[PDB]
Design a protein around this ligand. Structure first.
Ligand code: K
Ligand code: K
Ligand code: K
Ligand code: K
Ligand code: K
Ligand code: K
Ligand code: K
Ligand code: K
Ligand code: K
Ligand code: K
Ligand code: K
Ligand code: K
Ligand code: K
Ligand code: K
Ligand code: K
Ligand code: K
Ligand code: K
Ligand code: K
Ligand code: K
Ligand code: K
Ligand code: K
Ligand code: K
Ligand code: K
Ligand code: K
Ligand code: MG
Ligand code: MG
Ligand code: MG
Ligand code: MG
Ligand code: MG
Ligand code: MG
Ligand code: MG
Ligand code: MG
Ligand code: MG
Ligand code: MG
Lengths: 65, 94, 139, 378
RNA sequence: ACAGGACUCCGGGGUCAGCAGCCUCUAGCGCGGGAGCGAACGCGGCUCAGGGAAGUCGGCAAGCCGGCUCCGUAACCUCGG
RNA sequence: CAACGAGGAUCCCACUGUCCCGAGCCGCGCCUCCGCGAGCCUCCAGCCUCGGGAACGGGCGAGGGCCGGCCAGCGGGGCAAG
RNA sequence: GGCGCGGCGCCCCUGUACGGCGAGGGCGCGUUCGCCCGGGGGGCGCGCCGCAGGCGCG
């Protein structure tokens, strides 16, 4: 089934899950769950949040194709 | 007689009770659970058990205790000092 | 002959986030800065219940003291295009914006402004095709 | 004086009294009407509420705003292991309503049915149907009592029991229920059909069909003793009320000098016998089929049981039916399902593209354990 | 007979501006009794999406503000604020 | 009339469960049990509708209802008590 | 309705355990950092098993 990619973490989002948010510079953000949305709004750094795709890429655990 | 070895989960026994009473209700739960382990009518605890149960105040009791139960005559219960309770269960000797 | 009303078609019920007494941003370029919402059109009420509106609804406003003198002191029709209360679309998507916002618009369907700033919602764009035309982004 | 502003009353007085249900389970009050000439069918079945999920479906309405678009819908999964037909009852329409003729039982009866006859099974000494099995060993007797039913009874029902050793449930005795045989050409054809069913199993797929509509009957969730604000939905009084704002302020005028039955008061809330109607069937299938919940859209294999299991229910290992929407009761109550007496007239057909199988224990993001392990490899 | 009323001595440590609040050494340890359950309702508390006084006679109640350092401070005035 | 006020008033900002519209949680009562154990009040009694009547009856005329014994709540009556 | 107690596995929640070894502004000390390590801890849901489980009245 077609999915989405969480914009804060890197996970995939299944149909009927999460919530979107429309920024005022005409940009859409798709969140996996409330935890991810709270992290984003509080402005915590994705690199420093250790369970994220960005953090794993910057620690070398994931690959940058 | 017989010697039993058994762990009791204490956070599970103080569930649904006010936390200002956790250690006394843990004492009463341990006696009831030992009676329905060893099939006796009277259970003499040991101050080693009492010290272990109270070791963190009246509110925040330890999760797990390990008991040695010597059945005789009553049941006499003492504290067995173990680590991490990994894959331990009921042991019976005698 | 042709004297048709404003709202084009049917719209499904969504969550209503703005009750009477709310203040919202002016999204067009008429000169107004804040709009005070005093009534909702098509509203049948109930005892003690405040009238409430969602995106796509026509509301009645008054222009606040930070807006132009010539627009003030009058009751004006408007349409809400941006909402912070999160709502569910029929396809299963939940969505919300960062601010609350509307444009000044008559029930015939013509804007009193020439531009709209920021995104608008599919609800407003589908009921009002002039909004759908002059909008710069639709979510 | 008159009430100055107009406002309706709170709550529906046609659901009185608000007492706990005394019926044991949901009991089917009425059956769908018999149509002389219709093909034969059964009308009712009994399942156990298992869970909820959501599906994606392509809508083919007409004139609607969802005409050529996709919608996400809630669905409820009910688990229905096959039932066993054990007896036949006939009734007659008399100046005093429906009166029964006789009940003919099967020659050999199963353990769950025997168990429903007793309170504690291991202790009670077993003398149910002790003479009946001996007498009815030869089938001639059943032939003649069937002859009596054929001769004169006006409606036919079969008496069938569920089978709980095929569920995660805790009980061991069956739930016993009558399913009425409707349709056919005459009475005697219905009696012949009931004889052919006697002692066999019956699947829900041979009662209900996909896209049709049903009625669900069960007993609601219980909440115990509750006040008026929650039990009736009356307004809460102001903050500076001296002794509590969770009340009705006035419970009657001076005259008449009694409290009326239309005034809201406190008491038992929940655990009532209810009926929701016009539920559309999304599917009937089986859990032994590992392809049951797999659409042409997705290539991995999926089945009914979610990753982690059905929360607070258990594992479904047999047949299931899946309806649009919701239904009364918590997980694990027995639900009666019957045909819809007055169905809704414009319901677009069923066309499923995806079913959610991800974990409901928490916020599970993996459709299957295999791809969870691939994602968490090493 | 009793959460009331009833003058005065002596006055350690830590945080701190401190005889404030909070924790404590020395000394002392009653308070008409216990157990179980975890309904309504009440009494003392806590948190709540979106809106923000539309509530009410009335912003009653609650909440916002608050230490220290630097910046920057109007009308009016009995020239002291 | 500056300064001052637990003094009476109108308005704005900020703030909020005051409210739209309510929901969940904690402790202690309540509840059940072992021990202890009172006050107020009381013509006699305690189900209604109409009539007549000291012009608004529990008892009176005529109708309609109803085994008996209790609990948790509740505030319409007892023209409830003081 | 011979319950349960106690384990094991899955699945979720939080967010990478103690320790060990090797970067760190600086002057043997050093807040903090990287690796072992989506780790450690926890469970009131799901699945399968040591101690056990069917009481006196009437
Ligand atoms: K809003
Ligand atoms: K009135
Ligand atoms: K009134
Ligand atoms: K009320
Ligand atoms: K009344
Ligand atoms: K009533
Ligand atoms: K009422
Ligand atoms: K009440
Ligand atoms: K009903
Ligand atoms: K209780
Ligand atoms: K109550
Ligand atoms: K006000
Ligand atoms: K009002
Ligand atoms: K106030
Ligand atoms: K300030
Ligand atoms: K002065
Ligand atoms: K003064
Ligand atoms: K004063
Ligand atoms: K005054
Ligand atoms: K509540
Ligand atoms: K009269
Ligand atoms: K009268
Ligand atoms: K009263
Ligand atoms: K009266
Ligand atoms: Mg009102
Ligand atoms: Mg008072
Ligand atoms: Mg869930
Ligand atoms: Mg007002
Ligand atoms: Mg003074
Ligand atoms: Mg609410
Ligand atoms: Mg009287
Ligand atoms: Mg009489
Ligand atoms: Mg009164
Ligand atoms: Mg580490």
């Amino acid at each position: 089934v077609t999915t989405n990619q969480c914009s804060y973490s890197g996970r995939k989002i299944l149909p009927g899950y999460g919530k979107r948010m429309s920024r005022h510079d005409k940009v859409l953000l798709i969140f996996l769950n409330r935890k991810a949305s709270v992290h984003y709004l509080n402005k915590w750094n994705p690199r420093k949040i250790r369970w994220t795709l960005a953090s794993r890429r910057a620690r070398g655990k994931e690959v940058i194709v | 007689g017989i010697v039993y070895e058994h762990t009791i989960r204490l956070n599970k026994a103080v569930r649904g009770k006010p936390s200002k009473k956790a250690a006394p209700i843990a004492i009463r739960a341990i006696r009831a659970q030992v009676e329905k382990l060893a099939k006796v009518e009277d259970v003499r605890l040991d101050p080693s058990v009492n010290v272990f149960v109270w070791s963190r105040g009246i509110r925040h009791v330890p999760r797990r205790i390990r008991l040695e139960v010597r059945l005789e005559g009553f049941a006499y219960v003492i504290n067995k000092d173990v680590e991490n309770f990994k894959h331990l269960t009921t042991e019976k000797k005698g | 002959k042709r004297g048709r009303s404003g709202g084009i078609g049917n719209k499904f019920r969504i969550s209503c986030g703005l009750p009477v007494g709310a203040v919202i941003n002016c999204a067009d370029n008429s000169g107004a800065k804040s709009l005070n919402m005093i009534a909702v059109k098509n509203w049948k009420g109930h005892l003690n219940r405040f009238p409430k509106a969602s995106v796509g609804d026509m509301v009645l406003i008054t222009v606040g003291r930070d807006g132009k003198p010539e627009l003030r002191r009058k009751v004006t029709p408007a349409v809400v295009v941006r909402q912070r209360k999160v709502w569910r679309r029929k396809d299963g998507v939940w969505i919300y914006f960062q601010d609350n916002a509307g444009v000044i618009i008559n029930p015939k369907g013509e804007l009193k402004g020439s531009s709209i700033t920021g995104p608008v919602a599919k609800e407003a764009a589908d009921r009002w095709p002039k909004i759908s035309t002059t909008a710069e982004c639709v979510h | 004086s008159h009430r100055k502003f107009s406002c309706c009353r709170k709550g529906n007085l046609g659901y009185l009294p608000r007492k706990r249900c005394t019926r044991g389970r949901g009991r089917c009050k009425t059956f769908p009407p018999d149509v002389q000439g219709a093909p034969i069918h059964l009308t009712a079945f009994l399942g156990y509420k298992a869970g909820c999920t959501h599906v994606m479906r392509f809508i083919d309405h007409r004139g609607s705003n969802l005409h050529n678009r996709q919608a996400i819908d809630q669905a409820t999964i009910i688990d229905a292991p096959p039932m066993i037909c054990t007896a036949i009852i006939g009734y007659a329409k008399t100046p005093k309503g429906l009166r029964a003729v006789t009940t003919v039982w099967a020659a050999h009866i199963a353990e769950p049915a025997m168990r429903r006859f007793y309170r504690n099974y291991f202790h009670a000494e077993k003398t149910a149907f002790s003479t009946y099995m001996k007498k009815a060993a030869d089938g001639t007797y059943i032939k003649e009592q069937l002859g009596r039913l054929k001769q004169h009874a006006d409606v036919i029902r079969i008496v069938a029991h569920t089978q709980p050793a095929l569920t995660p449930l805790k009980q061991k005795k069956a739930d016993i229920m009558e399913i009425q045989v409707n349709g056919g050409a005459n009475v005697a054809e219905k009696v012949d059909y009931a004889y052919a069913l006697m002692e066999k199993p019956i699947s829900i797929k041979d009662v209900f069909s996909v896209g049709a509509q049903i009625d669900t009957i069960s007993i609601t969730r219980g909440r115990g003793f509750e006040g008026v604000v929650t039990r009736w939905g009356v307004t809460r009084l102001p903050r500076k009320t001296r002794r509590g704002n969770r009340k009705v302020a006035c419970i009657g005028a001076w005259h008449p000098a009694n409290v009326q039955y239309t005034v809201a008061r406190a008491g038992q809330m929940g655990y009532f016998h209810r009926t929701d109607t016009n539920k559309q069937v999304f599917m009937i299938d089986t859990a032994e089929n590992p392809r049951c919940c797999t659409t042409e859209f997705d290539l991995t294999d999926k089945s009914i049981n979610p990753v982690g299991g059905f929360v607070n229910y258990g594992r479904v290992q047999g047949d299931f039916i899946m309806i649009k929407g919701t239904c009364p009761g918590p997980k694990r109550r027995p639900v009666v399902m019957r045909n819809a007496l007055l169905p809704h007239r414009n319901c677009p057909p069923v066309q499923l593209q995806w079913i959610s199988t991800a974990s409901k224990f928490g916020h599970g993001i993996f459709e299957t354990v295999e791809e969870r392990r691939q994602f968490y490899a090493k």
